[PDB]
UniProtKB/Swiss-Prot annotation, chains A, B:
Organism field: Bacillus anthracis
Effect in UniProt of substituting residue 21 to A: Decrease in toxicity probably due to slow translocation of LF
Entry protein name: Protective antigen PA-63
Localization of this protein: Host cell membrane; Host endosome membrane
Subunit structure: Homooligomer; homooligomerizes to form homoheptamers (PA-63(7)) or homooctamers (PA-63(8)). PA-63(7) or PA-63(8) form ring-shaped oligomers that are in a pre-pore conformation, which do not penetrate the host membrane. PA-63(8) displays an enhanced stability, suggesting that this form circulates in the blood to reach and exert toxicity even in distant tissues. Interacts with lethal factor (LF) and edema factor (EF); can bind LF and EF simultaneously and interaction takes place following homooligomerization on the host cell membrane.
Site location (Cleavage): 20-21
Domain of life from the UniProt record: Bacteria
Domain remarks in the Swiss-Prot or TrEMBL record: To pass through this hydrophobic restriction, substrate proteins LF and EF need to be unfolded prior to translocation. The alpha-clamp consists in an amphipathic cleft between two adjacent PA protomers, which assists the unfolding of substrate proteins LF and EF. The alpha-clamp binds non-specifically to alpha-helices of substrate proteins LF and EF.
Job of this protein: Mature form that oligomerizes and forms a pore to translocate the enzymatic toxin components edema factor (EF) and lethal factor (LF) into the host cytosol. Following attachment to host cell receptors and cleavage by FURIN, homooligomerizes to form ring-shaped oligomers that are in a pre-pore conformation, and associates with EF and LF. Toxin-leaded complexes are then endocytosed in a clathrin-dependent process, followed by a conformational change of oligomerized PA-63 from the pre-pore to pore state, which is triggered by the low pH in the endosome.
Length: 49, 49
């Protein structure tokens, strides 16, 4: 059982160049991810000697 | 318990082709993280010999 909480961000860039228009930008934001993960695992093991 | 800190660099470049439209979108990105990773694991066993 894992209540794994990951809080992230966004960041990039972008520019524009042309015959007419020159522009730019920067991508920016925020994030928060959480994964409510549960599982189950069975196992056999047979050993000889 | 755990605490992931995933960082990143990037560098990108795209150009779109149209009739009278042109432009180069050269990019670069970076996005860090402040996470929280935790889990509770149970187990039984039965070793019969």
């Amino acid at each position: 059982t894992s209540r794994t909480h990951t809080s992230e961000v966004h960041g990039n860039a972008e520019v524009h160049a042309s015959f007419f228009d020159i522009g730019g930008s920067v991508s920016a934001g925020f994030s928060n991810s959480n994964s409510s993960t549960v599982a189950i695992d069975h196992s056999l093991s047979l050993a000889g000697e």
